Amino acid sequence: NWEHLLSLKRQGDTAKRLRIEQDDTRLGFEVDYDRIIFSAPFRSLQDKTQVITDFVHTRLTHSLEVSVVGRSLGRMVGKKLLEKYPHLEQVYGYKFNDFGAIVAAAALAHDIGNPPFGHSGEKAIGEFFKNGYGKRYKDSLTAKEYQDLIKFEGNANGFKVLSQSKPGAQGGLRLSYATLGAFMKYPKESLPHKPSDHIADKKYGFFQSERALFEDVAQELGLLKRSTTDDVSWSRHPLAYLVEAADDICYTIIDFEDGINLGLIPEEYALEYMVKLVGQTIDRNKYNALQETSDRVSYLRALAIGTLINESVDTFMKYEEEILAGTFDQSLIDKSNYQAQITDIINLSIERIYNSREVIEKEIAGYEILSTLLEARCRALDNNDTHYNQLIQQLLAPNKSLYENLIQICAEVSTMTDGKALRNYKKIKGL
Amino acid sequence: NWEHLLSLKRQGDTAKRLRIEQDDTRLGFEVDYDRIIFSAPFRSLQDKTQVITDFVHTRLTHSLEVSVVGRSLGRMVGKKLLEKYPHLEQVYGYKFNDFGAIVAAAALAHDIGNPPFGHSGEKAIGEFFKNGYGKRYKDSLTAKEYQDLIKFEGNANGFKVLSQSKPGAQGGLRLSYATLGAFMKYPKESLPHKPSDHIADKKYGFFQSERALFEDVAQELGLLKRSTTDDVSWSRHPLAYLVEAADDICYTIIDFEDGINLGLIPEEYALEYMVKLVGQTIDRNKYNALQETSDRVSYLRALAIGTLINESVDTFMKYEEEILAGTFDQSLIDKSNYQAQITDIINLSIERIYNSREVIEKEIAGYEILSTLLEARCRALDNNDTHYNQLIQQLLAPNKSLYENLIQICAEVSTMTDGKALRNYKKIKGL
Numbered sequence: 123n124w125e126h127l128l129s130l131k132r133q134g135d136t137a138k139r140l141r142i143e144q145d146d147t148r149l150g151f152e153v154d155y156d157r158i159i160f161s162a163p164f165r166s167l168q169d170k171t172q173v174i175t176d177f178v179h180t181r182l183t184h185s186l187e188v189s190v191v192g193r194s195l196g197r198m199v200g201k202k203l204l205e206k207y208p209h210l211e212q213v214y215g216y217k218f219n220d221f222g223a224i225v226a227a228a229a230l231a232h233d234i235g236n237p238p239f240g241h242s243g244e245k246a247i248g249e250f251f252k253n254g255y256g257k258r259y260k261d262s263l264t265a266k267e268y269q270d271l272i273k274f275e276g277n278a279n280g281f282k283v284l285s286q287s288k289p290g291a292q293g294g295l296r297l298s299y300a301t302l303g304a305f306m307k308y309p310k311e312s313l314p315h316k317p318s319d320h321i322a323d324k325k326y327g328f329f330q331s332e333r334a335l336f337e338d339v340a341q342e343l344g345l346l347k348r349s350t351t352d353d354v355s356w357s358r359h360p361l362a363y364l365v366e367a368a369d370d371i372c373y374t375i376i377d378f379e380d381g382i383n384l385g386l387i388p389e390e391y392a393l394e395y396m397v398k399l400v401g402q403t404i405d406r407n408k409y410n411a412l413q414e415t416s417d418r419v420s421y422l423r424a425l426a427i428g429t430l431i432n433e434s435v436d437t438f439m440k441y442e443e444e445i446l447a448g449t450f451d452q453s454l455i456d457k458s459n460y461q462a463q464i465t466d467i468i469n470l471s472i473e474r475i476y477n478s479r480e481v482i483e484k485e486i487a488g489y490e491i492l493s494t495l496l497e498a499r500c501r502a503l504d505n506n507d508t509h510y511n512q513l514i515q516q517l518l519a520p521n522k523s524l525y526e527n528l529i530q531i532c533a534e535v536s537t538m539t540d541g542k543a544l545r546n547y548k549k550i551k552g553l
Numbered sequence: 554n555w556e557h558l559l560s561l562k563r564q565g566d567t568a569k570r571l572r573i574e575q576d577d578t579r580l581g582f583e584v585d586y587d588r589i590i591f592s593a594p595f596r597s598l599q600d601k602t603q604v605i606t607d608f609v610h611t612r613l614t615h616s617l618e619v620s621v622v623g624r625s626l627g628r629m630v631g632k633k634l635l636e637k638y639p640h641l642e643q644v645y646g647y648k649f650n651d652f653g654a655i656v657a658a659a660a661l662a663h664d665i666g667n668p669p670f671g672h673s674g675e676k677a678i679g680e681f682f683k684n685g686y687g688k689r690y691k692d693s694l695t696a697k698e699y700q701d702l703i704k705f706e707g708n709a710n711g712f713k714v715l716s717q718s719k720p721g722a723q724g725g726l727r728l729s730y731a732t733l734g735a736f737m738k739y740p741k742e743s744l745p746h747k748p749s750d751h752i753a754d755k756k757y758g759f760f761q762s763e764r765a766l767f768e769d770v771a772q773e774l775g776l777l778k779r780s781t782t783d784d785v786s787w788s789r790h791p792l793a794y795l796v797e798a799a800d801d802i803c804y805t806i807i808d809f810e811d812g813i814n815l816g817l818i819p820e821e822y823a824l825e826y827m828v829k830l831v832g833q834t835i836d837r838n839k840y841n842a843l844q845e846t847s848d849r850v851s852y853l854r855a856l857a858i859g860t861l862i863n864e865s866v867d868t869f870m871k872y873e874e875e876i877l878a879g880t881f882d883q884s885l886i887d888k889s890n891y892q893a894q895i896t897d898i899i900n901l902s903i904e905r906i907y908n909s910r911e912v913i914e915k916e917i918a919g920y921e922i923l924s925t926l927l928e929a930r931c932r933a934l935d936n937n938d939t940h941y942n943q944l945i946q947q948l949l950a951p952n953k954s955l956y957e958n959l960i961q962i963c964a965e966v967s968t969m970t971d972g973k974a975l976r977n978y979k980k981i982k983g984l
């Protein structure tokens with residue numbers, strides 16, 4: 123039922139929030155976007171680079187552009203959903219911009235919990251608790267608590283960042299449950315690990331510390347159960363497919379755009395890899411008149427993203443009922459008519475960007491930086507009386523169960539800006 | 554007439570664009586926002602700091618937050634305007650989110666053309682042509698052409714950045730004329746200089762190179778004439794008052810928030826300066842429970858901005874007819890019941906932030922950096938045959954009248970990222 127999937131509930135609410143009773147100048151879904159923009163975690167993305175460190179390729183700009191693509195996807199699907207289910211507007215008061223706001227807010231916050239250095243950063247945190255100093259806690263943790271650590275997931279840390287309760291601030295940003303549902307691409311716990319090849323089982327979406335929260339979210343949204351055991355799992359909020367397509371589209375096309383502007387990808391490849399995606403719409407005489415490389419590739423990027431947005435909207439509507447029933451097993455982009463071209467683009471980015479020497483060097487350095495901060499925090503946790511460990515406390519974590527302390531340390535190390543992680547690492551090593 | 558003020562015209566259009574015939578998933582005003590987000594000038598704000606250089610206080614984040622405040626102001630005024638003038642919706646099809654989109658897009662682009670180093674940067678460019686090397690061109694320029702240079706204005710450069718025609722890309726971002734009108738806080742030429750004490754005459758809003766464009770914009774919007782001579786001037790688009798209030802509100806409250814987080818303003822001053830603005834709404838027990846300084850001041854900031862948004866909306870509606878008639882002589886914030894508290898906040902920021910030693914040092918360094926780049930570009934313009942000047946050409950301006958060349962040099966030097974301006978300065982001096 124879409125009416126339940128479009129929940130305006132916020133954590134702690136004691137009474138229902140009806141869509142028809144909202145002030146449209148203060149609509150819960152749009153407030154969610156504003157709350158993210160002004161949050162300290164989102165602002166910190168100003169000082170967080172992607173794999174390439176050019177000072178003009180931040181995670182902030184990526185997140186902005188993903189939210190813009192998400193708003194467009196949500197608006198377009200929202201208009202068509204209100205055509206399919208007219209009672210949603212005539213009776214319940216939903217409007218097509220409501221769907222754009224939900225997708226836009228969830229897409230804006232997708233990278234908010236990810237550690238520095240990309241997938242290497244997640245992998246370094248996991249290795250610390252699997253084989254590093256952190257393995258000593260294995261026997262003091264449940265299997266699912268330990269799995270949170272050895273397979274630490276930036277998606278699940280984002281959910282924690284958005285919802286974490288603190289003195290004077292219960293519920294974090296207190297986003298609408300529809301937004302938290304659209305945010306949750308992997309609505310399962312850390313265990314069991316990859317039970318199938320379904321896209322929603324590739325990773326997990328919440329830590330044990332947020333299990334009770336997502337239980338409240340899933341029951342309020344009426345998400346369909348995928349497990350009937352104590353290992354909980356649900357079918358994805360339909361709008362999470364649009365959040366994922368926005369991310370897939372931007373990662374594919376914009377990484378390519380960046381690789382060309384940065385010199386990693388020869389410009390001579392631009393047309394060849396994009397011709398299928400832009401062929402019918404490109405004004406070739408306009409393309410040839412553009413004099414700057416950055417202008418030519420941004421034109422191709424806009425055309426390719428527009429093509430993929432329109433197709434993703436149509437794919438969503440073709441499979442809407444399978445998605446609403448939890449039987450859609452793939453991503454929207456997996457069904458694309460351009461899958462072969464998308465794959466060639468992604469593979470070229472892996473070869474020329476993600477496996478470039480500068481990116482490899484940065485990830486190797488990231489492993490040391492994160493491993494050091496985790497060991498410093500964890501030894502300070504185990505012996506908090508020594509003078510050294512008191513200083514580490516004042517520096518890295520000023521102002522609980524063992525698991526709650528360990529997951530908090532991972533969450534705090536993960537959300538450090540690049541500048542503060544390297545600086546603090548430098549001091550703990552004297553540079 | 555609001556119907557004309559809400560023009561969807563884009564530069565070069567040969568036929569009218571009726572509001573009632575727009576696809577609401579592709580509304581011209583919302584497209585304007587997206588085009589700015591993806592533009593190279595907006596992305597470059599990632600590498601442009603405000604006066605304080607902390608790496609977590611960019612002009613990008615400021616612009617984002619101003620656009621969020623602007624969207625809220627536009628939404629709220631838009632709803633009330635459609636109540637006052639119901640034919641705008643029933644006959645012409647306008648919706649309250651239309652006004653939010655226009656204000657949001659114009660506010661997002663407000664700082665896009667400003668040079669580095671703030672007002673010192675504008676002043677350094679002006680001094681170069683008034684008393685530096687650039688004074689030699691005085692006699693080759695009209696009075697208004699020369700005034701563009703000696704009083705170089707970041708507001709007018711923003712209009713150029715948004716609209717500048719290039720091979721393969723006529724019209725720049727080609728924003729809706731309503732958005733360009735809401736953008737224009739000073740709808741006059743560089744001469745005459747400050748003809749009155751009206752807020753709209755404090756500066757000017759377009760260079761001679763964009764005069765013909767803004768003439769097209771003002772006639773399409775039906776803006777009221779303020780001069781009947783060859784020195785052209787118009788009354789402000791009413792929505793420009795909301796763009797200005799968003800900027801005024803954010804500059805006042807958020808500079809204060811930054812000054813406290815950065816240590817420049819003692820935290821003990823936070824409540825004293827904000828008590829009048831937040832008194833009725835602050836949950837003092839919640840405030841006392843917040844443990845981090847950044848959390849306490851962001852709570853006060855949200856309360857003060859909400860207070861000022863609500864009041865600014867009411868001030869706009871009280872004076873709507875004077876604004877529509879071009880007889881409103883002040884800013885919206887000038888009529889605020891908190892003017893005295895706002896002034897105390899602004900004065901404390903001037904004393905503790907803008908006059909701090911680190912800010913003074915940066916502005917002094919900015920004068921040298923910009924003066925050097927301007928002299929290098931201008932000597933290369935005057936003698937383009939020498940080997941040195943060919944290298945300067947390849948480095949700073951790869952790929953016209955004397956005035957068009959000089960204003961282009963100012964526009965390009967102004968939009969340089971901090972990193973590229975300092976690096977290029979370093980090379981021209983060998984560091």
Ligand SMILES: [Mg+2]
Pocket residue numbers: 184188232233369373
């Ligand atoms: Mg992403």
Ligand SMILES: [Mg+2]
Pocket residue numbers: 615619663664800804
């Ligand atoms: Mg500003």
